[PDB]
Design a binder for this molecule. Structure first.
Ligand code: HEM
Lengths: 100, 100
């Protein structure tokens, strides 16, 4: 399901930036390692996602020191992540209660 | 965020039906209890969601024995849930690796 995959990719990318500002190739490498090789993201996929996140004010970009484009979570992006994490956590506990 | 709330509601409703076929008022009651009262879903919200899920072949409906409309996960709906659970579980382990 394409839109769920995009949702999953967005969550992963935001959690990478939560660990620290990063650039596209560094993010790909980190996600490849964290997924034991099972998730090899494409440069162009990240550009597509980051254009939307920047438009929405969730992340911002800035140049490093061949200069790399770095991305950072914004203050709004951090707050949105925390709200999402807390509400999905409540969902998890609801589902836990529905089973046993 | 409205679309994330809808995503959360969909997941909860599908997990209710995973526990057994059910009807709208019974589902509301179960979700209210499982959320310790914090999630009181509206009849009309469930109708909206169930119209889409039925259209998509994820659930189907049938009459009980004042007769209630019962809903069941379909074979496709069960398979979609399992695939979603497995892939989001992989996401969780990816995020775990990104932290420590
Ligand atoms: C860790 C925090 C999580 C976030 C931020 C998150 C976010 C999202 C988003 C954004 C979507 C798609 C809806 C949209 O893009 O508007 C989605 C879909 C979904 N999530 Fe999560 N999610 C999280 C955790 C979980 C967990 C723990 C489960 C386990 C039950 C789960 C199950 C699902 C399912 C089944 C869908 C598919 C919804 C559909 O196809 O309609 N998610 N999630």
């Amino acid at each position: 399901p394409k839109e769920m995959l995009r949702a999953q990719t967005n969550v992963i990318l935001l959690n990478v930036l939560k660990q620290g500002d990063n650039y596209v190739y560094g993010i790909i490498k980190q996600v490849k390692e964290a997924s034991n090789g099972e998730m090899e993201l494409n440069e162009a996929t990240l550009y597509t996602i980051f254009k939307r996140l920047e438009k929405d004010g969730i992340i911002s970009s800035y140049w490093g020191d061949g200069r790399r484009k770095y991305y950072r979570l914004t203050e709004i992006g951090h707050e949105n992540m925390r709200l999402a994490f807390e509400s999905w956590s409540r969902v998890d506990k609801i589902i836990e209660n529905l089973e046993a």
